[PDB]
Design a protein around this ligand. Structure first.
Ligand SMILES: CC(C)CCC[C@@H](C)[C@H]1CC[C@H]2[C@@H]3CC=C4C[C@@H](OC(=O)CCC(=O)O)CC[C@]4(C)[C@H]3CC[C@]12C
Ligand SMILES: CC(C)CCC[C@@H](C)[C@H]1CC[C@H]2[C@@H]3CC=C4C[C@@H](OC(=O)CCC(=O)O)CC[C@]4(C)[C@H]3CC[C@]12C
Ligand SMILES: CC(C)CCC[C@@H](C)[C@H]1CC[C@H]2[C@@H]3CC=C4C[C@@H](OC(=O)CCC(=O)O)CC[C@]4(C)[C@H]3CC[C@]12C
Ligand SMILES: CC(C)CCC[C@@H](C)[C@H]1CC[C@H]2[C@@H]3CC=C4C[C@@H](OC(=O)CCC(=O)O)CC[C@]4(C)[C@H]3CC[C@]12C
Ligand SMILES: CC(C)CCC[C@@H](C)[C@H]1CC[C@H]2[C@@H]3CC=C4C[C@@H](O)CC[C@]4(C)[C@H]3CC[C@]12C
Ligand SMILES: CC(C)CCC[C@@H](C)[C@H]1CC[C@H]2[C@@H]3CC=C4C[C@@H](O)CC[C@]4(C)[C@H]3CC[C@]12C
Ligand SMILES: CC(C)CCC[C@@H](C)[C@H]1CC[C@H]2[C@@H]3CC=C4C[C@@H](O)CC[C@]4(C)[C@H]3CC[C@]12C
Ligand SMILES: CC(C)CCC[C@@H](C)[C@H]1CC[C@H]2[C@@H]3CC=C4C[C@@H](O)CC[C@]4(C)[C@H]3CC[C@]12C
Ligand SMILES: CC(C)CCC[C@@H](C)[C@H]1CC[C@H]2[C@@H]3CC=C4C[C@@H](O)CC[C@]4(C)[C@H]3CC[C@]12C
Ligand SMILES: CC(C)CCC[C@@H](C)[C@H]1CC[C@H]2[C@@H]3CC=C4C[C@@H](O)CC[C@]4(C)[C@H]3CC[C@]12C
Ligand SMILES: C=C(C)COc1ccccc1NC(=O)c1[nH]cnc1C
Ligand SMILES: C=C(C)COc1ccccc1NC(=O)c1[nH]cnc1C
Ligand SMILES: C=C(C)COc1ccccc1NC(=O)c1[nH]cnc1C
Ligand SMILES: C=C(C)COc1ccccc1NC(=O)c1[nH]cnc1C
Lengths: 391, 391
């Protein structure tokens, strides 16, 4: 069977799968069509079952860097803890919402065991193509279901565990698509101050009275992003002074594309905040404050300059010390900016300004898309910054 | 200035431009936010003005195949006729809706004159990068505005001219993105029967009483897509019999990717129709008919087999006659299937089944995304089929 024929048919089957899923979600979004949620959950359950059957055959036939695998395993284990909580709820409160968690837990176990023990190889190329493309778009549809459906201890625990589930499904979908295309072919002192201020702000918030806490969160974010922009810009300036060939790797290219694709969520969130801020300021209202406009423009500019710095640092006496201290300072700053959203410091959802401009559903869906991508971006940047720091 | 630095900053600026536009459209979609339509029209007017300023500088500094250019010129001239109609309306019925049509007409004139007389070149690479990426995302935002806002003779003419405007903006955006990435680097008898039946069905419909006309449209489409699937499949079978190396071009790759990206609209439309059909059939209702389910599954399968055939025909005595007659038959069938939507035979919008399942706004937006892409697909396939027919 010709290779191109399969590279094309696999892609068409996968795209049709995604568009059928999107069609069912559109029928659901209406809320007056016959299509109800349990039909979507059943569709995705069938799409997870087929993938389990495929991976089972694959493991039957197969018998006859670490940063991305450890990240996938830890996000899959958080997703599994969430599923265990959902199975416990179902058992206590007893149809499709009981059978979904169990096929989801089996799907995550099989998918971790597959990603870990996968071997690149040759006779079975159509099988691998159609199965990886099924896995990619089943994980995308699961990401979409999570983003659309999240709009005693069973309510307090999901709040903390949903971002990692959504981030797990988009991440594994990205890695599986990357695997499809290739078938058949002083700085420490500042860093510590950053970590301490982060953990403090988080404890303060989660103990909380509350408006002062969110104000403290925004002031922290603004100061942190300003000093980060300064660090990355000084790194770029030291690069521009020391004119070097700036030439030469698939891994480096994947890293660049992931680093720039993980920022779409935060950029959308920042531009929604800026649009709401200027719209409300047009009314000549007392509500307009410059700590949300500044914090959003600094979000945009900080992740732009950081992306530029990391990419220029990967494709490339006092300059060596200056780059070491800049890389360590940004390492610790990105850790400090990852700990806040991860540990429940997500105060954006209750913002009354973007809830009144965009509506509660649109704002919470934008945040559900953005905050998981933000966590991924921050920790991918931490990995890239350590890799730069070692060179 | 390093090249990568610019390839990256251009992409980040363009992505931020797109996300700011999407944020303004989200603020508009709510319908209760301060953001009203004239603010979007003004944003896009600024984004067209900046592009005109860029192209003016570019033409100042520059002094010191044909299928895709003729297609762009003819779709730009239809868009210009639409803009002339809008300027005439404004003049008769007299703020932002008057200044938008005129900057849009200037933008289309400048953009045609730019695409025609563009030269690949070297000192000014950052300028070209930032300007082509501005053009790509300004054309995308114009596509989005058209798709979202279309949801005496000034009402009858836009109905016929809007699909070509939307198709023009997505097409020119695609070509400009393709231009960005490369900076600094018997069958005739059946075919005639097809053409005659098309023109007949169209005249019948536009003269119309009406339910029989839409039924005739669906029966025509079903028979035509069945015989097309048979033709493409027989071509693929003749290929599979004659085992050939099936090896070896940038143009061929662009053609394949455009041919498969133009089908997303039709596939989404077909899967929405299938989801609505099975949802209504679940109620055990008398409305369920198999001429909409069949016509949708045939849409999906026909464009899959056609894509496969064209791609296998580009990357590659009675077999030669059989392939000539198959290519000519599909040439004329795709012309017959392009003439119906182009000349006003668009009966999908008034479908009560997908209007009740998905809602009128979601269905009309899905059709506004799909029917322009469908026209592009059909005529791109006609071009590819003639190119195959000559070899
Ligand atoms: C591989 C690439 C495309 C990245 C993955 C992203 C997609 C999976 C996204 C892109 C656009 C998304 C769609 C865009 C908007 C909608 C409409 C939304 O419903 C409404 O807006 C309801 C409208 C109403 O209020 O009536 C439901 C989700 C859906 C289908 C989204 C589902 C997920 C999609 C396909
Ligand atoms: C994952 C990477 C590769 C791409 C991310 C691109 C995002 C900018 C896209 C993808 C999904 C999109 C969302 C898909 C669906 C929705 C829900 C939609 O609102 C509803 O569905 C509510 C309807 C109602 O309340 O009646 C508003 C737009 C939004 C947030 C979309 C905004 C644009 C998003 C976030
Ligand atoms: C370069 C690639 C991404 C192709 C180009 C496609 C994008 C320009 C599309 C993909 C998803 C689209 C968005 C997905 C859904 C929405 C939500 C829609 O508003 C609602 O659904 C309102 C929700 C409600 O009812 O409350 C307005 C358009 C918007 C922002 C879309 C704008 C155009 C987007 C960004
Ligand atoms: C152009 C190529 C490269 C990609 C095409 C992908 C499409 C499948 C995406 C892009 C734009 C998306 C649309 C963007 C916005 C909308 C409008 C949205 O409905 C509303 O905004 C209505 C809100 C209301 O009525 O309150 C429903 C989903 C839909 C049609 C989205 C469905 C998925 C679409 C067609
Ligand atoms: C080892 C790696 C993967 C980290 C694991 C973190 C685990 C231990 C975390 C993640 C989410 C957490 C839960 C989130 C919230 C609640 C609800 C509260 O009323 C009791 C504690 C409980 C139930 C937490 C227990 C600890 C928990 C399960
Ligand atoms: C609604 C969302 C999806 C809008 C954004 C879609 C498009 C414009 C985005 C999505 C991801 C983006 C890519 C992500 C990363 C890279 C690698 C970088 O070295 C050059 C730019 C490039 C190649 C980007 C180009 C623009 C891009 C393709
Ligand atoms: C691997 C990483 C990402 C795991 C992160 C797990 C985080 C979210 C977990 C670890 C310990 C957890 C806390 C443990 C106990 C409590 C006390 C309880 O009364 C409220 C929830 C709260 C405050 C939990 C919140 C979530 C928490 C901070
Ligand atoms: C030369 C190429 C680009 C094709 C051009 C086609 C032109 C001539 C077509 C496209 C749309 C057409 C218009 C669409 C509908 C109407 C409204 C009707 O009440 C009078 C005729 C009028 C005003 C048409 C005149 C002819 C028209 C302008
Ligand atoms: C809502 C819409 C955008 C969903 C679809 C998005 C993704 C999955 C689609 C959009 C366009 C698609 C590409 C279009 C064309 C080609 C060239 C072909 O030789 C291999 C598949 C490939 C490379 C497709 C892969 C899947 C793809 C990237
Ligand atoms: C280059 C190609 C795509 C141009 C296509 C232009 C098409 C849409 C134009 C050409 C001539 C036009 C027709 C000319 C005259 C009339 C009679 C009028 O009472 C109703 C509109 C109607 C029936 C027009 C409909 C649109 C039309 C068919
Ligand atoms: C030991 C570890 C790296 C795990 O730390 C985590 C804990 C929870 C969630 C995610 C991650 N890690 C990541 O996401 C990561 N690391 C590098 N690249 C990515 C994408
Ligand atoms: C991190 C993300 C937002 C994931 O985005 C995706 C979503 C669905 C499918 C694929 C991808 N990512 C990619 O394909 C990619 N990223 C880098 N290099 C490639 C080839
Ligand atoms: C002489 C012509 C080709 C023009 O015919 C048209 C008329 C109206 C609208 C579009 C087109 N042509 C196309 O769209 C085309 N041709 C090849 N590739 C594409 C994308
Ligand atoms: C025909 C379309 C649906 C256009 O889709 C787009 C929309 C916005 C920007 C770019 C593209 N198309 C591409 O980038 C493309 N198509 C083929 N090869 C490339 C490199």
């Amino acid at each position: 069977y010709p290779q191109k024929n399969a590279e094309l048919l696999s892609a068409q089957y996968g795209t049709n799968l995604l568009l059928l899923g999107v069609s069912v979600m559109l029928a659901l979004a209406a809320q007056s069509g016959p299509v109800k949620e349990e039909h979507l959950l059943s569709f995705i359950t069938v799409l997870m079952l087929v993938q389990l059957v495929w991976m089972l055959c694959y493991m039957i036939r197969r018998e006859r860097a670490s940063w991305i695998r450890g990240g996938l395993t830890m996000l899959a284990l958080l997703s599994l803890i969430m599923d265990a909580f959902r199975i416990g709820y179902f058992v206590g409160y007893h149809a499709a919402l009981g059978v979904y968690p169990i096929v989801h837990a089996l799907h995550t176990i099989s998918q971790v065991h597959f990603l870990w023990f996968h071997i690149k190889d040759k006779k079975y190329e159509t099988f691998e193509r159609f199965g990886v493309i099924h896995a990619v778009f089943t994980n995308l549809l699961l990401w979409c279901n999570g983003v659309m459906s999240e709009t005693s201890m069973f309510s307090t625990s999901l709040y903390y565990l949903y971002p990692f589930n959504i981030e797990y499904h988009i991440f594994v979908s990205a890695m599986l698509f990357v695997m499809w295309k290739n078938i058949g072919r002083l700085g420490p002192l500042g860093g510590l101050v950053a970590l301490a201020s982060s953990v403090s702000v988080l404890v303060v918030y989660l103990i909380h009275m509350h408006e002062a806490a969110v104000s403290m969160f925004y002031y922290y974010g603004v100061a942190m992003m300003a000093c980060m922009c300064v660090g990355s810009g000084t790194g770029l300036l030291v690069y521009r002074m020391e004119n070097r060939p700036m030439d030469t790797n698939p891994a480096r290219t994947l890293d660049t594309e992931l680093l720039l694709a993980s920022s779409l969520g935060s950029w959308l969130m920042s531009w929604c905040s800026v649009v709401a801020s200027v719209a409300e300021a047009g009314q000549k209202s007392p509500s307009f404050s410059w700590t949300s406009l500044t914090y959003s423009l600094l979000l945009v500019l900080e992740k732009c300059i950081q992306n530029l710095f990391i990419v220029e640092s990967l494709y490339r006496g006092r300059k060596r010390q200056i780059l070491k201290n800049i890389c360590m300072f940004l390492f610790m700053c990105n850790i400090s900016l990852w700990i806040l959203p991860a540990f429940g410091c997500r105060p954006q959802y209750d913002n009354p300004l973007e809830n009144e401009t965009f509506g509660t559903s649109v704002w919470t869906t934008v945040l559900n898309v953005a905050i998981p991508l933000n966590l991924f971006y921050r920790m991918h940047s931490v990995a890239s910054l350590f890799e730069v720091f070692r060179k």
